[PDB]
């Protein structure tokens, strides 16, 4: 009794029918999405918790999964599953949740349900349990009409098969109704009338308005408070309730500054629920003050603490990242998930109005049981068949181990790889031009494991390094084309230590561009960041970035060799 509850989270790539599907289930029942939709189906109560967009919204994806006992993956019947919902699905699997797959928009012409079933099945190469990829039921749906069915040619007149599937395959909450009250805050909310609102799934006991309560944070500090209002979810709404009990997803009111991972307990049985998530970072990278002779030239805020300041503001936007204090009091060791994670952070701090020097990204090594390990990750690539042998050749040099390949039948092909992050770093640049911009690459962290012995191929070419500061003249540049490709044309302002071109040969060449042209190479941030070597840096400024050596002068470099 009182276990007719079904707490489920819903996942769907944008414009795949998740707002429209839940919108049916609501109107066909006895009861933008809301962060939670409550649904009455006969005597079952279904909580459909919405998942956020496909950026790390502070890691709300783990918070949401912490409140649900199953996940509902909605998939377009033609386009199939999209890579953007990779990580949300991944985390649902990490929380041991078994999925319910809804294949929507099945009434569209060209719909290929058989194909998207295989795609979704294959996508569950999220090293997930046999258990999870086993026996995930499949419901076909056309929410535009409101049709659900276990087959797509045979189909019910409404959404009943979906309800039934939810009831049948979603476990009831693992909660104790008789124990003392216990509830962890999973999300927060505010209304100028009520104050701060705390949201979670009651793990134990029951709660009434005006009940006395004790809140314990992660570390173990406690305070006493009196709950004001207990708000239960009904439609897209919250009504005041006189009673909420274990398994219920509700919102609480009378408590003060509730923090996510706070545990609300009966005053005499205070027991904190374990703080839940952390994406351990896997790629480190150094942010530095821009030591260039172009200090404050194109960027407003450029100081040591000026950077460290914002280096403790984005800490809360993001638990995947860390920030550390280096001994050089003008440079900092910031780590993240992928190189893509840290990259756009700069591209934002760029037009956030900054100026900083940044190293090349390296994997964070870890020692486990005396044996050092590194991060490996899953890579899937979609190229044409003309590049097939080419990108295959390249990935093997970066210690990529081929696991699968699947021709499109229409001239393309998808490859699958297990690769150390070490070998994958900065590939995208080499990928696109190689595949001429048509190929597609996706990556997902898998596991740490014993390092692959050896090193990845270095840059091979050397760089043309400026010997002085001034405006580059076309007269000189024309002479440099005899021995490489350039990064600028006539009239560009340069200083000493700056890298201005790519040497045709292997060694670094200090060159003078101060004493008509072929088109210059302009490098995007990512592009240029993949180019940089360990003894070099990228200088980033609000409308463009420069490539520079660590030691700016000829003499200093020679000493360091
Ligand atoms: N053929 C077919 N189409 C479906 C179905 N379900 C949803 N759609 C289409 O997708 C659109 C709904 O967008 P959602 O898919 O619900 O948005 P969401 O991913 O963020 O949840 C509808 O038009 P829309 O509301 O005008 O889109 P928009 O203007 O809100 O972006 C409708 O055209 C279906 O079962 N069959
Ligand atoms: Mg929309």
Residue numbers in the entry: 1 to 31, 56 to 539, 556 to 601
How does the study describe this entry?
The translational GTPase BipA regulates the expression of virulence and pathogenicity factors in several eubacteria. Full-length BipA can be subdivided into five domains. Beginning from the N terminus, the first four domains are homologous to domains I, II, III, and V of EF-G, whereas the last domain at the C terminus is distinct and protein-specific.
To gain a better understanding of the effect of ppGpp on BipA, we solved the structure of full-length BipA in the presence of GDP to a resolution of 3.1 Å and in the presence of ppGpp to a resolution of 3.3 Å. In each of these structures, the nucleotide and the coordinated magnesium ion can be localized unambiguously in the initial unbiased difference electron maps. Surprisingly, the structure of BipA with bound ppGpp is very similar to that of BipA with bound GDP, reflected in a low r.m.s.d. of 0.28 Å across all matching main chain atoms. The additional 3′-pyrophosphate of ppGpp extends toward the 5′-pyrophosphate group chelating a magnesium ion between them. The small numerical value of ΔCp for GDP binding was interpreted as reflecting the absence of a conformational change of EF-G upon GDP binding. GDP-bound BipA has similar values of 32.02 and 32.68 Å for Guinier and real-space Rg values, respectively, and a Dmax of 107 Å, as does ppGpp-bound BipA with a Guinier Rg of 32.21 Å and real-space Rg of 32.94 Å and a Dmax of 111 Å. In the case of BipA, it is not simply the GTPase domain by itself, but the whole protein that adopts the same conformation upon binding of GDP or ppGpp. Our results show that the binding of ppGpp to BipA does not induce a nucleotide-specific conformational change, suggesting that both the ppGpp nucleotide and the small ribosomal subunit must be present to switch the binding specificity of BipA.
